[PDB]
Amino acid sequence: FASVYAWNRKRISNCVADYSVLYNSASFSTFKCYGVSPTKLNDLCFTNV
Amino acid sequence: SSTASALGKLQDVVNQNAQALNTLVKQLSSNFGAISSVLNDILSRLDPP
């Protein structure tokens, strides 16, 4: 992982994302979303993540 | 028959009513400080609390 002043950036599109396997894992200390409730993440389709 | 501009009062009443309805239905497209102007997206995107 790069430095904070040189933060690593990535663009992802044209795929199917399963956030449930990200949500259930306890390896993350903080899992905090703002504009969306996490449990509904699998019910939406976006562009340019 | 010739001069079309003869019945002004009735037309004014009709125009006033139509404009009132138009602005009333147009007011539905405002955020009012919220995150979206459509309630279905808020229901289907975000946590109740």
From Swiss-Prot, chain B:
User: Which domain of life, per UniProt?
Assistant: Viruses
Record note on what altering residue 12 to N does: In strain: Delta/B.1.617.2, Mu/B.1.621
* Region ranges (Heptad repeat 1): 1-32
- According to the UniProt entry, the coiled-coil residues are 11-49
Instruction: Tell me the outcome of changing residue 43 to F.
Output: In strain: Omicron/BA.1
Q: Changing residue 31 to K does what?
A: In strain: Omicron/BA.1, Omicron/BA.2, Omicron/BA.2.12.1, Omicron/BA.2.75, Omicron/BA.4, Omicron/BA.5, Omicron/BQ.1.1, Omicron/XBB.1.5, Omicron/EG.5.1
State its role.
Subunit of the fusion protein that is processed upon entry into the host cell. Mediates fusion of the virion and cellular membranes by functioning as a class I viral fusion protein. Contains a viral fusion peptide that is unmasked after S2 cleavage. This cleavage can occur at the cell membrane by host TMPRSS2 or during endocytosis by host CSTL. In either case, this triggers an extensive and irreversible conformational change that leads to fusion of the viral envelope with the cellular cytoplasmic membrane, releasing viral genomic RNA into the host cell cytoplasm.
UniProt-recorded name of the protein? Spike protein S2'
Q: Which organism is it from?
A: Severe acute respiratory syndrome coronavirus 2
Q: Which gene encodes it?
A: S
Section covered of the full-length record: 939 to 987 of 1273
